[PDB]
Structure formats: C-alpha cells, structure tokens
C-alpha cells in the first residue's frame, strides 16, 4: 500500500538552528567587537 507513484520517482543537527546565525553571520565576531575598544 506504500508506493503508488514514488518507486518511479548529540550532533550538530540540533545546533543547525543558531548555526544558521553562525554561517551567514558573525564569523569574525570578537575580531570586530573585541576591537571596538581601540577602533573608536
């Protein structure tokens, strides 16, 4: 009963949520926020 069209056609798996904030963003985070002391 299982098929009918379709036979023709802890890890980081939970860390993926904030890793979506880690991959597109904030990879040099305290390399700029840590340099807010002396940049200005």
């Amino acid at each position: 009963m299982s098929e009918k069209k379709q036979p023709v056609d802890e890890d980081n798996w939970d860390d993926d949520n904030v890793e979506d904030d880690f991959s597109n963003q904030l990879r040099a985070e305290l390399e700029k926020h840590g340099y807010k002391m002396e940049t200005s």
């Binding site: 802890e10 890890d11 860390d15 963003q25 904030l26 985070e29 305290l30 926020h33 807010k36 002391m37």
Partner: protein
C-alpha cells in the same frame, strides 16, 4: 592511569586549534611519546600530525618496551591460569590491559571492557571501563563511546548510591551535555561541588570550579544566580584564587555596559582553550550577551541607544546590527528605532504569549493521535 594520557588528549586538543604550526605539535608530541610506553599517542598523531624520519632508535626501542610488556603478559596470564581465585587472569591482566589500551588502540575494548565485564558484579571495575570510554571519547573526541559508557553505566545506576564516583558520573554526563549545546543539566549536576574533592580522573579541582561556574553562570535565573554564585559559601575561596573569574561574576552582576565587554573579552580568551567547548565558542558568547541585554532591557522603557553607546564603548552602528540580529533571531523582544530612537519593551508572559502552546501541542501531538484515530476501518 587516566590523567597523563588524558592530558595528552588535551594535547590532541592542542593539535586542534593551532593548526598552522607544526612545531608545537612535534615538541610535546615527542615529550608525550617518549614517556611511559605510549604507542597510540604518536600512532594517531602519526596518522594526523607530522610523520617519522625513522623510529628505530627513536620509538622502536619503545615498541621493544611494548614487546617486553607483552612477554610479561605472556608470563602473567599463564601464571594466573594456574591460580583459581577472583579471576586472576582477567583482574591482574585488566590492569596491564587497560595499560595496553593506554599503549595502543581500542583493542582495550576486547581486553578491558568485557574482560572485566564478564566476571564482576561490582561497579568499580565497570566504572573504570566507563571512565576509559570517557578518556577515549576524549582521544577520538567520540560521540559514540561517550554515549556507550553511559549505556554501560546505567546497567548499574539502577541500584546504587555512592559518595564521590556517582557524582563524577553526574560530572561526565554533564560534560557530555555541554559537549554539545546542552547546558542546564550540566550545571545542575555539577552544583554539588563538595564531594568531588580529588580522584585520579580529575584534573585541577580549581579548574573543575571554573568549569562549573562557566556552565552555571547561565541557566540560572537572577535569584538563583545571586544565591549560588554570590551567596555560595565554599565556592568563594576556589574563585578567590582566580581574580578574573570573581571579577567576571561581579562585572556581570554589576550590570555595567563596558565592563560587560571587558569581562566578556576575558571569557572570550578563556572560551576556546577548552576541549569539547571550543567548537562551541559562539552561542555561549551571545548567550552571555542575551542574558545581559535581557536583564538590562526589561527595566527601562524610555531607552535610547545613545545611552547604550555612551557607556558600552562604541555602539553607534556597532550594536545596531548586533541587537537587530538578536531581536529578529527570535528572542530578546524590544523595538529598535529610526532616529526617533526609543527602545520599547514587552510583557512578562503573564497573560498574552502564554496563550499559544496549548493549541500548539493540541494541534501536533493530538493530530498524530488524530491519525491513529482515523485508523479504525481501513
């Protein structure tokens, strides 16, 4: 029998973050590979770090020491097969065989795990095995064996009660938790810092204090926060050793703006140098941030970000994208503004936001049983 090659597993973590260098590898690589018959700490590092010029007078004298250790195994278990006692072979050879697992690979499985697991009923030898799957889940940085030792230890958690070592089970289950983003049970099970005084799987007990305070500074609400990290009696001395740790707590509880980031730079330096914590260096830092902004932003309602940037350091555009990501990330509900510049806060979830999760579960899980309800006829 645990802590030297566990420290060499910390040297594997020293191989982890400084990658560009091949000299700080080889120096204490040779220092850890000339001491105390350790074939595997240069064998896997032969598989990872620099290879060998030769090994004949260098380390085949230590495979010759391994040969000597092996021929006295062939002395010992053939001298213990005559004796008929407390499984003399498996006991007096699980000693040298956990030492063999210190020498070489996971053949310590067959010659330790079941070699003492098929005889005993006491949890001491099996718990040495659990601690050795812990140390080899520190060698290989396992996800497997540091769960398999829990799978083996819960076979004797079901009857127990013991003073130090079961609290150490709590400690390493918490290290398994906060080896990934699992955070509160680690601190809750570390919180009984008294009975964990010194056993020969510990590192510096003071560093155990630093690790429990790093994990207990968050997942601990402000009354519990002040009662534990402030009103803690015996904790105060073992954080009076390190000034910057007590400075970190009093700078966080002080709730300033720039000593937030000075303190946070100290714990930025500290958080990396930490094995099975340094690949988790990011959500802890913005977790400190989200706790700080959450305790600082509910109280005001006529708030300007000029009042922030006057005392954070610089935030005129520097905290702009920071707080914007923090708000639109799902949490830290306030409103960031155009140059009208009034930051507007929200409710304590006493009335409004509470009214969702009931139908959020009566949809999902009750809809799974709607499917099973529609399993009647066909």
């Amino acid at each position: 029998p645990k802590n030297p090659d566990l420290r060499i597993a910390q040297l594997r973590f020293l191989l982890s973050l400084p990658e560009h260098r091949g000299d700080a590898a080889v120096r204490d690589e040779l220092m850890a590979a000339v001491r105390d018959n350790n074939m595997a700490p240069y064998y896997e590092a032969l598989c990872k770090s620099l290879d060998w010029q030769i090994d004949v007078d260098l380390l085949n004298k230590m495979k010759k020491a391994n040969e000597d250790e092996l021929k006295r195994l062939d002395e010992e278990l053939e001298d213990a097969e005559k004796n008929l006692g407390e499984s003399e072979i498996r006991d007096a050879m699980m000693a040298k065989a956990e030492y063999l697992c210190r020498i070489g690979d996971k053949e310590g499985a067959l010659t330790a795990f079941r070699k003492t697991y098929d005889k005993t009923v006491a949890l001491g030898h099996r718990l040495d095995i659990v601690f050795y799957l812990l140390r080899i889940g520190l060698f290989y940085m396992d996800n497997d064996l540091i769960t398999r030792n829990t799978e083996k230890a819960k076979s004797l958690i079901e009857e127990g009660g013991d003073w130090d070592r079961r609290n150490r089970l709590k400690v390493y289950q918490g290290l398994y938790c906060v080896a990934i983003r699992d955070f509160k049970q680690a601190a809750e099970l570390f919180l009984d810092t008294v009975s964990t005084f010194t056993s020969y799987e510990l590192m510096d007990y003071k560093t155990f204090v630093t690790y429990t305070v790093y994990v207990s500074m968050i997942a601990l609400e402000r009354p519990d926060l002040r009662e534990k990290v402030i009103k803690g009696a015996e904790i105060l001395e073992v954080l009076h050793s390190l000034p910057a740790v007590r400075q970190y707590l009093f700078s966080l509880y002080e709730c300033r703006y720039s000593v937030f980031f000075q303190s946070l730079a100290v714990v930025e330096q500290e958080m990396k140098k930490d094995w099975l914590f340094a690949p988790h260096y990011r959500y802890y830092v913005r977790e400190m941030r989200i706790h700080a902004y959450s305790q600082l932003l509910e109280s005001y309602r006529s708030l300007t970000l000029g009042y922030m940037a006057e005392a954070f350091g610089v935030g005129v555009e520097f905290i702009d994208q920071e707080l914007s990501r923090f708000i639109a990330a799902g949490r830290l509900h306030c409103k960031i503004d155009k140059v009208n510049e009034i930051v507007e806060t929200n409710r304590p979830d006493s009335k409004n936001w509470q009214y969702q999760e009931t139908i959020k579960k009566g949809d999902l899980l009750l809809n799974r049983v709607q499917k099973l309800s529609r399993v009647i006829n066909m």
